């Protein structure tokens, strides 16, 4: 198992636009189009995206581009930034996975704003980070994956997801 597996089983793979837990207009392996309710944002900005006139429809490999571009993405969002980089390079590679998939899904901003947590990860208190996790609106509105992702870093192996 890697990140890339990981995120596939947590997001799916869609290649018509559709809404996320948030009701946000997403396509392929989680790309978010935008938060605008508009759909005709949305299309305009999947066209920009691919570089094409899509109609709303991709291929897999065009699902899979984006995918590559967006893990890498956030991969270097948690290098540059100052809260999430020493967090990040004390864990161990399966609870970096893990916080990987954290920022993918709610970007270097968000994440950088569960303080709490974060500090526990790096005092690796595992318990503890699996129940401050717990309370947030992000596990209370989408909460399965919310549930993988947390398990993973309370136990470090990916039995979550096997
Ligand atoms: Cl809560």
């Not at 996320?20 to 995206?49: F, M, Q, R, V």
């Not at 270097?108 to 005092?123: D, H, I, K, P, Y």
Request: proline letters at 2%.
């Amino acid at each position: 198992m890697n990140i890339f597996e990981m995120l596939r089983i947590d997001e799916g793979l869609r290649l018509k636009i559709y809404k996320d837990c948030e009701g946000y207009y997403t396509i392929g392996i989680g790309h978010l189009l935008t938060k605008s309710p508009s759909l005709n944002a949305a299309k305009s900005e999947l066209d920009k995206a691919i570089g094409r006139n899509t109609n709303g429809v991709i291929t897999k490999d065009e699902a899979e581009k984006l995918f590559n571009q967006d893990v890498d993405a956030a991969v270097r969002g948690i290098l540059r930034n100052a809260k999430l980089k020493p967090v990040y390079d004390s864990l161990d590679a399966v609870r970096r996975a893990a916080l990987i998939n954290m920022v993918f899904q709610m970007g270097e901003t968000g994440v950088a704003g569960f303080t709490n947590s974060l500090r526990m990860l790096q005092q690796k208190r595992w318990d503890e980070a699996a129940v401050n996790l717990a309370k947030s609106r992000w596990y209370n509105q989408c909460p399965n994956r919310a549930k993988r992702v947390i398990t993973t870093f309370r136990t470090g192996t990916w039995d979550a997801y096997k």
